[PDB]
């Protein structure tokens, strides 16, 4: 029966994502903030896709590193072909869902990866940041508050739901996210911001002394 | 079951690397020191990947020789396309992780081998040497102090953790490495150094009379 194989593959994927770290991408007044429990100082699980499009992932590293590189390549090609403002987070999320579904179906080994694509409004415009979560099977969900991925999801998600704050500043949002992730110190923490107040490139890494200052 | 097959494959790799020699890559004041158990003389278990990037491995000589040649080709092509200072140890370690994951997934027989990529600071620059360990399944780790691979890893690793001290001299580090490796002789050992005081090419083999006087 194909269905038995499908259930085995699905459970393998949820197990693989289950034994990983946790990522929280939460929308705040200045844009989107990504916080991940990343002990390594070299492997980067949060990156930039395009001028206002940011990428976060959970699961096996090389799978979502290849997915990140493919998404960056697609965004660059699309922005060159037509225009920079013609690249949106929706198209990238759709391409990610397409390729994840194709990998799940055709390929023998499913990708044990969960992806988050965040888009913020351009400079001089006002729009609610849009977060798209793409799951292993290719399912895509638009979540308008905050994405939590990898590890134990239920407790951190529930803590965030209890302590949700609309239009929170960056410092409060960072404290909220690190407290939810604990439910951790400054080290082993990778953070970034899609900053809607920057003119062209919204992505900005907050490392070292700034993380200590904000905490 | 596919789970059974994957468990057996990981165990296969564990045995294959277990019945192999041990190599130790330890950071010291002048850079990195590689010491390998090589009862051969023509075959080399330690090589140079690029100007400040060195390679060590443990497993069967065919697979990590192929991987070493591939990494050399990648580093040379990357340095020619952009610049010699645009090649980093992190890029090579990431490429090794990706290719080892692909080999594990696709090959009928996986490449049972462990790799270590060491990088030292460029000339006229101070920076903590970086060591990366890449395993049979594509997993990559960053170690700040030492790397031990192959053989009975537990006793030698614990002996290193007991006896390794940072900012060691070349003679002191070599004595520490050999003493930890006992857990052997003057010969049957392959000695190399990534030397941060060299102008361009760090890697240097220390064999024969120089090693004899050093030991």
């Amino acid at each position: 029966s194909p269905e038995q194989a499908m259930r085995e593959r699905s459970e393998l994927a949820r197990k693989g994502i289950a034994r990983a770290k946790s990522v929280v991408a939460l929308a705040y007044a200045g844009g989107v903030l990504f916080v991940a429990e990343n002990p390594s100082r070299s492997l980067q699980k949060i990156s930039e896709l395009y001028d206002r499009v940011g990428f976060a992932a959970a699961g096996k590293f090389n799978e979502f590193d290849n997915l990140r590189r493919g998404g960056i390549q697609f965004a660059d090609t699309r922005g060159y072909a037509y225009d920079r403002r013609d690249v949106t987070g929706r198209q990238l999320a759709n391409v990610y869902a397409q390729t994840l579904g194709t990998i799940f179906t055709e390929q023998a080994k499913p990708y044990e990866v969960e992806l988050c694509v965040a888009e913020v409004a351009h400079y001089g415009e006002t729009k609610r940041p849009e977060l798209y979560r793409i799951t292993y099977d290719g399912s895509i969900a638009d979540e308008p508050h905050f994405v939590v991925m990898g590890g134990t999801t239920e407790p951190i998600a529930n803590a965030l739901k209890e302590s949700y704050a609309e239009n929170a500043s960056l410092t409060d949002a960072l404290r909220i996210a690190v407290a939810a992730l604990r439910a951790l110190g400054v080290a082993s923490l990778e953070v970034a911001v899609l900053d809607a107040n920057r003119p062209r490139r919204a992505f900005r890494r907050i490392t070292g002394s700034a993380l200590q200052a904000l905490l | 079951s596919p789970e059974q097959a994957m468990r057996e494959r990981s165990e296969l790799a564990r045995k294959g690397i277990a019945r192999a020699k041990s190599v130790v890559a330890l950071a010291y004041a002048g850079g990195v020191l590689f010491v390998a158990e090589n009862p051969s003389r023509s075959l080399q278990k330690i090589s140079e990947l690029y100007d400040r990037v060195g390679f060590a491995a443990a497993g069967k000589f065919n697979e990590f020789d192929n991987l070493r040649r591939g990494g050399i080709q990648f580093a040379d092509t990357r340095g020619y396309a952009y610049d010699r200072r645009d090649v980093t140890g992190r890029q090579l370690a990431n490429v090794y992780a990706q290719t080892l994951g692909t080999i594990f997934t696709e090959q009928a027989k996986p490449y049972e081998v462990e790799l270590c990529v060491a990088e030292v600071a460029h000339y006229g620059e101070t920076k903590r040497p970086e060591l990366y360990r890449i395993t049979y399944d594509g997993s990559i780790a960053d170690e700040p102090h030492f790397v031990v691979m192959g053989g009975t890893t537990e006793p030698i690793a614990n002996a290193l953790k007991e006896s390794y001290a940072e900012n060691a001299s070349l003679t002191d580090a070599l004595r520490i490495a050999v003493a930890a490796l006992r857990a052997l002789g003057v010969a049957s050992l392959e000695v190399a150094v990534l030397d941060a005081n060299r102008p361009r090419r760090a890697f240097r083999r220390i064999t024969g009379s120089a090693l004899q006087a050093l030991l």
């Binding site: 034994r19 990983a20 699961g59 096996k60 044990e112 990898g150 | 990559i140």
Partner: peptide
């Protein structure tokens, strides 16, 4: 697998 590399999950960190």
């Amino acid at each position: 697998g590399q999950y960190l």
